[PDB]
Scaffold this active site. Structure first.
Site, PDB file in Angstrom:
ATOM      1  N   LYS E  41      16.401 -13.624 107.838  1.00 61.63           N
ATOM      2  CA  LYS E  41      17.212 -14.550 108.622  1.00 61.63           C
ATOM      3  C   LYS E  41      18.567 -14.860 107.989  1.00 61.63           C
ATOM      4  O   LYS E  41      19.449 -15.376 108.681  1.00 61.63           O
ATOM      5  CB  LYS E  41      16.423 -15.833 108.888  1.00 61.63           C
ATOM      6  CG  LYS E  41      16.178 -16.707 107.681  1.00 61.63           C
ATOM      7  CD  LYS E  41      14.962 -17.589 107.919  1.00 61.63           C
ATOM      8  CE  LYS E  41      14.494 -18.279 106.655  1.00 61.63           C
ATOM      9  NZ  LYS E  41      13.864 -17.314 105.710  1.00 61.63           N
ATOM     10  N   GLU E  67      19.943 -23.671  99.615  1.00 71.83           N
ATOM     11  CA  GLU E  67      19.633 -22.251  99.519  1.00 71.83           C
ATOM     12  C   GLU E  67      20.118 -21.730  98.166  1.00 71.83           C
ATOM     13  O   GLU E  67      20.563 -22.493  97.311  1.00 71.83           O
ATOM     14  CB  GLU E  67      20.263 -21.486 100.685  1.00 71.83           C
ATOM     15  CG  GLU E  67      19.485 -21.615 101.989  1.00 71.83           C
ATOM     16  CD  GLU E  67      18.078 -21.050 101.923  1.00 71.83           C
ATOM     17  OE1 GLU E  67      17.921 -19.822 102.098  1.00 71.83           O
ATOM     18  OE2 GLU E  67      17.128 -21.837 101.726  1.00 71.83           O
ATOM     19  N   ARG E  68      20.015 -20.418  97.962  1.00 73.45           N
ATOM     20  CA  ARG E  68      20.392 -19.844  96.674  1.00 73.45           C
ATOM     21  C   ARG E  68      21.896 -19.942  96.447  1.00 73.45           C
ATOM     22  O   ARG E  68      22.693 -19.726  97.365  1.00 73.45           O
ATOM     23  CB  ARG E  68      19.962 -18.379  96.581  1.00 73.45           C
ATOM     24  CG  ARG E  68      18.491 -18.116  96.830  1.00 73.45           C
ATOM     25  CD  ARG E  68      18.206 -16.627  96.750  1.00 73.45           C
ATOM     26  NE  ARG E  68      16.816 -16.293  97.025  1.00 73.45           N
ATOM     27  CZ  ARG E  68      16.265 -16.329  98.229  1.00 73.45           C
ATOM     28  NH1 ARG E  68      16.955 -16.685  99.296  1.00 73.45           N
ATOM     29  NH2 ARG E  68      14.988 -15.994  98.368  1.00 73.45           N
TER      30      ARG E  68
HETATM   31  N1  LIG Z   1      18.335  -4.716 108.628  1.00 73.26           N
HETATM   32  C1  LIG Z   1      17.602  -4.697 107.504  1.00 73.26           C
HETATM   33  N2  LIG Z   1      17.221  -3.502 106.990  1.00 73.26           N
HETATM   34  C2  LIG Z   1      16.491  -3.489 105.866  1.00 73.26           C
HETATM   35  N3  LIG Z   1      16.059  -4.517 105.134  1.00 73.26           N
HETATM   36  C3  LIG Z   1      16.445  -5.681 105.664  1.00 73.26           C
HETATM   37  C4  LIG Z   1      17.196  -5.859 106.813  1.00 73.26           C
HETATM   38  N4  LIG Z   1      17.406  -7.210 107.054  1.00 73.26           N
HETATM   39  C5  LIG Z   1      16.789  -7.804 106.058  1.00 73.26           C
HETATM   40  N5  LIG Z   1      16.181  -6.942 105.183  1.00 73.26           N
HETATM   41  C6  LIG Z   1      15.429  -7.252 103.969  1.00 73.26           C
HETATM   42  O1  LIG Z   1      15.266  -8.663 103.849  1.00 73.26           O
HETATM   43  C7  LIG Z   1      15.634  -9.047 102.510  1.00 73.26           C
HETATM   44  C8  LIG Z   1      16.015 -10.503 102.453  1.00 73.26           C
HETATM   45  O2  LIG Z   1      17.008 -10.818 103.452  1.00 73.26           O
HETATM   46  P1  LIG Z   1      17.322 -12.312 103.848  1.00 73.26           P
HETATM   47  O3  LIG Z   1      17.959 -13.012 102.712  1.00 73.26           O
HETATM   48  O4  LIG Z   1      18.158 -12.297 105.146  1.00 73.26           O
HETATM   49  O5  LIG Z   1      15.891 -12.960 104.200  1.00 73.26           O
HETATM   50  P2  LIG Z   1      15.341 -14.417 104.550  1.00 73.26           P
HETATM   51  O6  LIG Z   1      14.130 -14.417 105.409  1.00 73.26           O
HETATM   52  O7  LIG Z   1      16.516 -15.190 105.147  1.00 73.26           O
HETATM   53  O8  LIG Z   1      15.068 -15.026 103.091  1.00 73.26           O
HETATM   54  P3  LIG Z   1      15.278 -16.355 102.270  1.00 73.26           P
HETATM   55  O9  LIG Z   1      14.837 -17.561 103.052  1.00 73.26           O
HETATM   56  O10 LIG Z   1      14.499 -16.168 100.956  1.00 73.26           O
HETATM   57  O11 LIG Z   1      16.785 -16.371 101.911  1.00 73.26           O
HETATM   58  C9  LIG Z   1      16.731  -8.054 102.160  1.00 73.26           C
HETATM   59  O12 LIG Z   1      17.009  -7.994 100.767  1.00 73.26           O
HETATM   60  C10 LIG Z   1      16.133  -6.758 102.698  1.00 73.26           C
HETATM   61  O13 LIG Z   1      15.171  -6.201 101.815  1.00 73.26           O
HETATM   62 MG   LIG Z   2      18.379 -15.136 102.430  1.00 72.85          MG
END
Ligand SMILES: Nc1ncnc2c1ncn2[C@@H]1O[C@H](COP(=O)(O)OP(=O)(O)OP(=O)(O)O)[C@@H](O)[C@H]1O
Ligand SMILES: [Mg+2]
Ligand SMILES: Nc1ncnc2c1ncn2[C@@H]1O[C@H](COP(=O)(O)OP(=O)(O)OP(=O)(O)O)[C@@H](O)[C@H]1O
Ligand SMILES: Nc1ncnc2c1ncn2[C@@H]1O[C@H](COP(=O)(O)OP(=O)(O)O)[C@@H](O)[C@H]1O
Ligand SMILES: [Mg+2]
Ligand SMILES: [Mg+2]
Lengths: 173, 342, 345, 86, 230
Positions: E41, E67-68
């Site tokens: 996300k 967040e980070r």
């Molecule tokens: N389009 C994509 N193709 C491949 N991997 C993806 C893609 N989108 C996201 N990812 C994977 O998701 C990982 C984390 O992405 P992101 O920071 O957006 O996640 P999140 O659910 O928002 O996490 P958090 O809450 O910990 O920040 C990326 O490092 C990658 O491995």
């Molecule tokens: Mg993230």
């Protein structure tokens, strides 16, 4: 333990006593109230579940030589809230508030040797430098210090005992 | 071991004179302000459920009468209030503007116009909290309420005076079905009321726009309690709409009230309860949450013509009135086992 | 004179203080003037010196602190006997059919002890309902209890109405109908059904409806049961129809939260089984007369496993468990033959 | 102006004058009644598990010995009891 | 005020194929990205930032809420190395800061977005994680002397969420377009915080771990993602 619920009553009673300047008389009134609370036959009654009005008026009949208008009305408020056992603590906090207002402090002096009058004199002068308040020294004799003097201004403590110096050294090594 | 709003200058006042003078029992002072709940010291004559007037033009509802305290919830922006403000109890329970002139308007839960089309032309005031018609004052429901959807009108009939639950998960068409039912009454002789609890304001704007494209808006009242308004206003919003529906019922006409997300009312009453430190229950809801919805929905009735003649003092003879309710509830992934859905 | 004052008002719970000499007893009744209207209070607990915690038998709105309260020195007492037949009454035994005063000759208290062990009677006379699944899988005796277990919308009211038609007309005796937390529309439907059937003059009705405060709904059943006991002690055989026992327990739960009782499992009151037992044990047939009882019980979420359905199973002679699943498939009556039975089989 | 011993004796005198007596250690009074549970003030010598005698030839059991009350459970119809009964 | 609001049907194309077809998002509306821990996300929002900035000319605000710090640092240097930083205003309240900072940082960002709206412009407002805002209130709530509600949450949760959500909106003088990342605890989409967040959004894209584990990115669930514009 009623240390935390005693503060409002102590403060309010002290302010009222100050407005009418009879602080010493108020302290007498509260001392009388605190001693009746310690009685064997009263300490049974105070724990019973009587309605505040009846219980209070029994206490008031027993509490002769108080002022109807002000002191006995403090009794009424404490009875309403069911806090008559707070009186032995309200008394101590009233005395503390008085000591604060009168800019006067009580401190303890402790040593293994009974202190000479010149030592006590210089102690009082020095403490009155450290403390804005005038000081009443209390002499306690305890072989624990082994030598030197322990200064105890309540929570603020200055340790001048050989034993303290020794058990402080033991942890350095 | 705890204090109970026994504080220094109040105690000193009582020390000076224990049997403090009668003064006025009509008035008191705020001693605490937090999260839209205020504690008031004094108000010896405040009745349970009464409106308390506040500085400015604001009100609170006295919900807890305790030993030398009143707990009251503020019906608006509370954060401007302060300790030591004077307050006066009215003689009044909460009442709302009511009448035929409300048709086509958008109003808040106090009945103030919110659409900007100018002041109301109501027909007097009605109490927000009221008792439903008794057993002997009902009549059986036999006339239809035509929804316009084949499945509903065939398999799940709705009659004048019925209370039909619409229940499902998020984004399942609940709002759309209800509002289409309003639109089908555009030429039916049934007045419609739509009361929206806890919804975002632009969604209400959007549904009013759809109601205005079709001819339905000129036949409906919209009552709004947005997500930014205090929990008291959301909790009281359904009852004001019911009080507007009862105007038509008690005068021999038909009305259709669409309570929207009655669940977002239950959350509000819970917030009030837990802020007022009442004993919590299942899913932390107050025990008396059944009574809330029970005394709201039982106002939806069909009343016999003798009740209508007795109420209107003989001005309307021989016609039954009706109020039809369509509550809407949201399920967490469809579990009927939850407390409010059950 | 009035000797007490209100000290708190929290929802349906009213706190009243009296002088320490004259404290009313538990389940006593008190009376206060709320605006223009007389409000009855029932004493639940004696707490501290001079204070009784009470439950209101009407709307709490308009009550002030410091209102005077009068101690009627007896429980709530209701009119019983022949003068109640054909009349609708509320929890207090007041007339809500707008036909005038009841005109009773006797009034009984709604709180009383159960029949003694020595006084019970055993008989197994079978009764015929005319309904296949019930007559087949759960035959009724006379004087027993019949539970109709079901969730929302499975046929409890239709089965109770058909059973009323079949049993009551043939009964040749008095009957009592108790509406506990019943929908006002359905109460009107039943009243008009009974008068159109020209059987109303052998049935007494007590209604406490959903909109009513918890006090009213809580004590309505005891009122109807007291009327049934009056007919029993005259030596008659009577039918007692109770339209849902669940909301007795549920009104008890709402009350219990604010009485200061510590909560119990599934949010229920600690006293759930005690309250149920104090109600059900009065409903029996003795050596002097017989009460025959038909009871609907709401099972939440069709669970059948939460404490209120669990506790009520123990008390009943005949058990009919309507199932949502059979009804959903479109088959009526929805009786499950694998969970329904009678101790007469 | 008066000393602690003086004040103590005066307190005992005036307590005697106005008749605020204490309970006998084997007796007490009911102070609360609720749901078949009764609270008793007194009974300083009651022991846990002991039988407490009520009026009308009824019994109760001492289960919750507390600093200022004895929580007891009635072994029969409890509704007669009242705050103030010995 | 309700009288001040505005509505628009104008489709604002976003490059991602799934979002536009299943859940079209219009200019001046609210979009919410729902997902558990590590399901994409944040990255999806960076693709939206890239694609939306193609056809948007005005200013934008970014609120980093709980967040980070590294994500923000990397973002800032990407913005400065592409010279687009001259048009973005940033507020940071990241996850190492004490509860009060993380609670009130969101409100600050709304203050700035509302200024640029009230100048009559159109504004893009990105919120790094709105879940942390409710959780900060949870962390503070019991210390304020309030009885717990539901699964240990503050009793005023719905009002805290609503009072913030109702002022991030368009008006007849200008419009705010907003994307909000919505963390869901323990992958539980029925938890009260995500549950009450659903009602405040126009387009909701629901990401799922089961699809990400199959390699399929962007891991949108087409059977739960929805839009008011479809
Ligand atoms: N389009 C994509 N193709 C491949 N991997 C993806 C893609 N989108 C996201 N990812 C994977 O998701 C990982 C984390 O992405 P992101 O920071 O957006 O996640 P999140 O659910 O928002 O996490 P958090 O809450 O910990 O920040 C990326 O490092 C990658 O491995
Ligand atoms: Mg993230
Ligand atoms: N008959 C229908 N045909 C097509 N789309 C429909 C129909 N009924 C409703 N919808 C669509 O369903 C979507 C959700 O509508 P609605 O807001 O009424 O749902 P809901 O279950 O009440 O949701 P919520 O509780 O989130 O407000 C809308 O996009 C609406 O256009
Ligand atoms: N024997 C039956 N024949 C036809 N419909 C029935 C029968 N029993 C129940 N129903 C259906 O059940 C609903 C009403 O049942 P009711 O007994 O009032 O509900 P509850 O069981 O909750 O009291 C209606 O849909 C009605 O058609
Ligand atoms: Mg909807
Ligand atoms: Mg029914």
């Amino acid at each position: 333990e009623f240390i935390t619920v005693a503060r409002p009553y102590a403060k309010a009673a002290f302010d009222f006593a100050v407005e009418h300047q009879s602080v010493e008389r108020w302290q007498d009134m509260l001392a009388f109230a605190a001693e009746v609370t310690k009685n064997e036959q009263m300490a049974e009654l105070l724990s019973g579940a009587l309605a505040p009005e009846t219980l209070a008026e029994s206490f008031i009949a027993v509490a002769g030589e108080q002022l109807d208008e002000n002191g006995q009305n403090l009794i009424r408020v404490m009875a309403e809230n069911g806090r008559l056992n707070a009186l032995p603590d309200v008394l101590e906090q009233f005395i503390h508030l008085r000591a604060v207002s009168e800019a006067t402090a009580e401190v303890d002096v402790i040593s293994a040797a009974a202190l000479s009058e010149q030592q006590l004199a210089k102690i009082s002068a020095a403490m009155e430098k450290r403390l804005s308040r005038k000081v009443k020294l209390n002499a306690k004799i305890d072989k624990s210090v082994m030598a030197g003097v322990i200064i105890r201004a309540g929570d603020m403590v200055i340790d001048g005992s050989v034993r303290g110096r020794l058990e402080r050294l033991a942890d350095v090594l | 071991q705890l204090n109970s709003t026994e504080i220094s200058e109040l105690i000193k006042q009582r020390i000076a004179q224990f049997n403090v003078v009668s003064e006025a029992h009509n008035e008191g002072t705020i001693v605490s302000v937090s999260d839209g709940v205020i504690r008031i010291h004094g108000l010896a004559d405040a009745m349970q459920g009464e409106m308390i007037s506040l500085p400015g033009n604001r009100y609170a509802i006295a919900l807890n009468l305790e030993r030398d305290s009143v707990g009251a919830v503020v019906m608006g922006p509370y954060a401007d209030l302060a300790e030591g403000m004077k307050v006066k109890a009215t003689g009044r329970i909460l009442e709302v503007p009511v009448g035929r002139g409300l048709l086509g308007r958008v109003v808040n839960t106090l009945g103030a116009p919110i659409d900007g089309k100018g002041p109301l032309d109501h027909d007097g005031f009605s109490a927000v909290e009221a008792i439903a018609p008794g057993v002997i004052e009902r009549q059986s429901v036999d006339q239809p309420v035509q929804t316009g959807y084949k499945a509903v009108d065939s398999m799940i009939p709705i009659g004048r005076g019925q209370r039909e639950l619409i229940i499902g998960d998020r984004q399942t068409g609940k709002t759309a079905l209800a509002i289409d039912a309003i639109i089908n009454q555009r030429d039916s002789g049934i007045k419609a009321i739509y009361v929206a609890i806890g919804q975002k304001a632009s969604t209400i704007s959007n549904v009013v726009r759809k109601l205005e494209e079709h001819g339905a808006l000129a036949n409906t009242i919209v009552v709004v309690a947005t997500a930014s308004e205090s929990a008291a206003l959301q909790y009281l919003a359904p009852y004001a709409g019911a009080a507007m529906g009862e105007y038509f019922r008690d005068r021999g006409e038909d009305a259709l009230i669409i309570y929207d997300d009655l669940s977002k009312q239950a959350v509000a009453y819970r917030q009030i309860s837990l802020l007022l430190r009442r004993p919590p229950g299942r899913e932390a809801f107050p025990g008396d949450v059944f009574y809330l919805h029970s005394r709201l929905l039982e106002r939806a009735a069909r009343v016999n013509a003798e009740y209508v003649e007795a109420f209107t003092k003989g001005e309307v003879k021989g016609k039954t009135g009706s109020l039809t309710a369509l509550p809407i509830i949201e399920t967490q992934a469809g579990d009927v086992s939850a407390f409010v859905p059950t | 004179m009035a000797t007490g004052k209100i000290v708190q008002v929290i929802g349906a719970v009213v706190d009243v203080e009296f002088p320490q000499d004259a404290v009313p007893r538990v389940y006593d009744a008190l009376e206060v003037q709320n605006g223009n209207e007389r409000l009855v209070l029932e004493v639940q607990q004696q707490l501290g010196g001079g204070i009784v915690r009470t439950i209101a038998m009407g709307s709490s709105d308009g009550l002030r602190r410091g209102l005077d309260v009068k101690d009627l020195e007896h429980p709530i007492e209701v009119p019983v006997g022949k003068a109640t037949l054909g009349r609708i009454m509320n929890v207090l035994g007041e007339p809500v059919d707008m036909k005038g005063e009841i005109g009773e000759e006797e009034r009984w208290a709604i709180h009383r002890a159960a029949p003694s062990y020595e006084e019970l009677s055993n008989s197994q006379e079978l009764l015929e309902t005319g309904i296949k699944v019930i007559d087949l899988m759960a035959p009724f005796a006379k004087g027993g209890k019949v539970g109709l277990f079901g969730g929302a919308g499975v046929g409890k009211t239709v089965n109770m109405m058909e059973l009323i038609r079949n049993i009551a007309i043939e009964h040749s005796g008095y009957s009592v109908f108790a509406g506990v937390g019943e929908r006002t529309r359905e109460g009107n439907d039943f009243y008009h059904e009974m008068t159109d059937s020209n059987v109303i003059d052998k049935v007494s009705l007590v209604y406490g409806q959903m909109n009513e405060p918890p006090g009213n709904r809580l004590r309505v059943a005891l009122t109807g049961l007291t009327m049934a006991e009056k007919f029993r002690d005259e030596g008659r055989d009577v039918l007692l129809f109770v339209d849902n026992i669940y909301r007795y327990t549920l009104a008890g739960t709402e009350v219990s939260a604010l009485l200061g009782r510590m909560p119990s499992a599934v949010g229920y009151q600690p006293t759930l089984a005690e309250e149920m037992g104090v109600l059900q044990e009065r409903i029996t047939s003795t050596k002097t007369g017989s009460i025959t009882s038909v009871q609907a019980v709401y099972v939440p979420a069709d669970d059948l496993t939460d404490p209120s359905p669990a506790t009520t199973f123990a008390h009943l002679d005949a058990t009919v468990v309507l199932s949502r699943q059979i009804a959903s498939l479109g088959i009526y009556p929805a009786v499950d033959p694998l969970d329904s039975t009678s101790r007469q089989l």
